[PDB]
Ligand binder design. Structure first.
Ligand SMILES: CC(=O)N[C@H]1[C@H](Oc2cccc(C(F)(F)F)c2-c2cccc(NS(C)(=O)=O)c2)O[C@H](CO)[C@H](O)[C@@H]1O
Length: 159
């Protein structure tokens, strides 16, 4: 089982930065939609759904730093979850050698930030833990953490 970010090199476990461009200017009540399907893809290293990989996102996945006061929802594989995750998500099966974009979007609504900076350029905005286990033997379980990082400042000048 392997993943990559923005078509980069293979990732088999561990923590990886994922850089995203965000709507730079927003108003009170407006959300930010972070489509991570456009950035992270994973595949099965045998193909043919031999030793299918089973992946889900993990309880405890959360906003980072100042964003923990913000409201969040996480879309994963046809289901919406409150964010931060207080449970694990449903399981996605991965068996093809051709990468599958992760069916993952983060919806963010800033709270208590009106009149200033909402998100800083270069700041980790969320840490999303992903769990993999396959089918044969031990399943060789692996942990991934996706550190979502904003490429740019976001401001909410009004309110
Ligand atoms: C031991 C193991 O992980 N077996 C898993 C096995 O892993 C591999 C199978 C064939 C080739 C390789 C490779 F190393 F040549 F790539 C692997 C491998 C092995 C460690 C890591 C990774 N990911 S990477 C290259 O570090 O980014 C891939 O894939 C299964 C289906 O996805 C199952 O997922 C199997 O569990």
């Amino acid at each position: 089982f392997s993943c990559n970010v923005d078509g980069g090199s293979s990732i088999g476990a561990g923590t990886t930065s994922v850089y995203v461009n965000l709507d730079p200017v927003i108003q009170p009540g407006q959300n930010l939609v972070v489509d991570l399907s456009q950035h992270i893809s994973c595949w099965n290293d045998y193909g043919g759904w031999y030793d299918t990989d089973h992946i889900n996102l993990v309880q405890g996945s959360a906003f980072a730093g100042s964003l923990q006061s913000y409201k969040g929802s996480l879309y994963w594989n046809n289901v919406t979850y409150p964010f931060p995750l207080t449970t694990n998500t449903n399981v996605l099966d991965i068996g093809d050698k051709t990468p599958m974009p992760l069916p993952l979007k983060l919806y963010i609504t800033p709270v208590g930030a009106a009149g200033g900076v909402v998100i800083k350029a270069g700041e980790v905005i969320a840490r999303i833990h992903m769990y993999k286990i396959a089918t044969l033997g031990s399943g060789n379980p692996r942990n991934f953490t996706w550190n979502i990082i904003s490429n740019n400042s976001v401001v909410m000048p009004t309110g």
